[PDB]
Design a protein around this ligand. Structure first.
Ligand code: JLA
Length: 283
């Protein structure tokens, strides 16, 4: 079926939970043996969210190459994304090592450091120009260059230096600051505006390594971001845009990381975002 009318048919019939459970039942199951090794317990935020072995990002280290991060490679859309958990106190250096090694231009953050009164990820970037951060375990230096605070999101320019080689690179930090503590946003308009700002920066384009996207577990909000981006790109590329099937795209993405889209409300929000976004792309 088309998307917008499938949408009203699920709303009128109140069957979002049943649609979402079907997706969960049909989703891929692949091994995640490296994630579960005892030496990696303090590298995982949640025991039930792990990268598959076949798609995990490897750190360029011989001691321990593990990080909780996955490469989502979308062949028809010609887009790639790295989805990862919010960094932990003992993985902030690994996080920036990955950004460096994978040649990423942008980092997309969809959570606040504290939500619901608890810490959802480490404070992993510097908050003042004159107070830079040094990650001694991976030999990197990170400096805040500029910051632009808007009503729904903040964009930061960061300088990452590889202290071994003295090479430097400019990284863009895109921080969506207004996702509610509970539920999903009422309107997708600010989320779509944010997606378009990431696109306009070059961070999603083939001349750079994959964008790094995270929330707390790296599967819910993060899944919503890449699912909406890929569906809208496919609607522009195909002769028949009404052939784009958001449930099939989501199942393809779940071949590369488990659990993408965590609730039926996130599934409905993803439909809403793609539907509204497809009208703005043209008019
Ligand atoms: O009939 C439809 O459902 C339909 C869906 C998407 C669409 N596009 C137009 C071209 C790029 C943006 C969305 C056109 C038609």
């Amino acid at each position: 079926m088309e998307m917008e009318k499938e949408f009203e048919q699920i709303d009128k019939s109140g069957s979002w939970a049943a649609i979402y459970q079907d997706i969960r039942h049909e989703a891929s199951d692949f091994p995640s043996r490296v994630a579960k090794l005892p030496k990696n317990k303090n590298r995982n935020r949640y025991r039930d969210v792990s990268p598959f072995d076949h798609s995990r990002i490897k750190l360029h280290q011989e001691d321990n190459d593990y990080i909780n991060a996955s490469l989502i490679k979308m062949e028809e859309a010609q887009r790639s994304y790295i989805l990862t958990q919010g960094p932990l106190p003992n993985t902030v250096g690994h996080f920036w090592e990955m950004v460096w090694e994978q040649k990423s231009r942008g980092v997309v953050m969809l959570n606040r450091v504290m939500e619901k009164g608890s810490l959802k990820c480490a404070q992993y970037w510097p908050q003042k120009e004159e107070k830079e951060m040094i990650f001694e375990d991976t030999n990197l230096k990170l400096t805040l260059i500029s910051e632009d605070i808007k009503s729904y999101y903040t964009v930061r320019q960061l300088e990452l230096e590889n202290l071994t080689t003295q090479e430097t690179r400019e990284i863009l930090h895109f921080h969506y600051t207004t996702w509610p503590d509970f539920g999903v946003p009422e309107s997708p308009a600010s989320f779509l505006n944010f997606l378009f700002k990431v696109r306009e920066s070059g961070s999603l384009s083939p001349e750079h390594g994959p964008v790094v996207v995270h929330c707390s577990a790296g599967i819910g909000r993060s899944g919503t971001f890449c699912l909406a981006d890929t569906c809208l790109l496919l609607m522009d590329k195909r002769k028949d845009p009404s052939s784009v099937d958001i449930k099939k795209v989501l199942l393809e993405m779940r071949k590369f990381r488990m659990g993408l889209i965590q609730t039926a409300d996130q599934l409905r929000f993803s439909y809403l975002a793609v539907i509204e976004g497809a009208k703005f792309i043209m008019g």
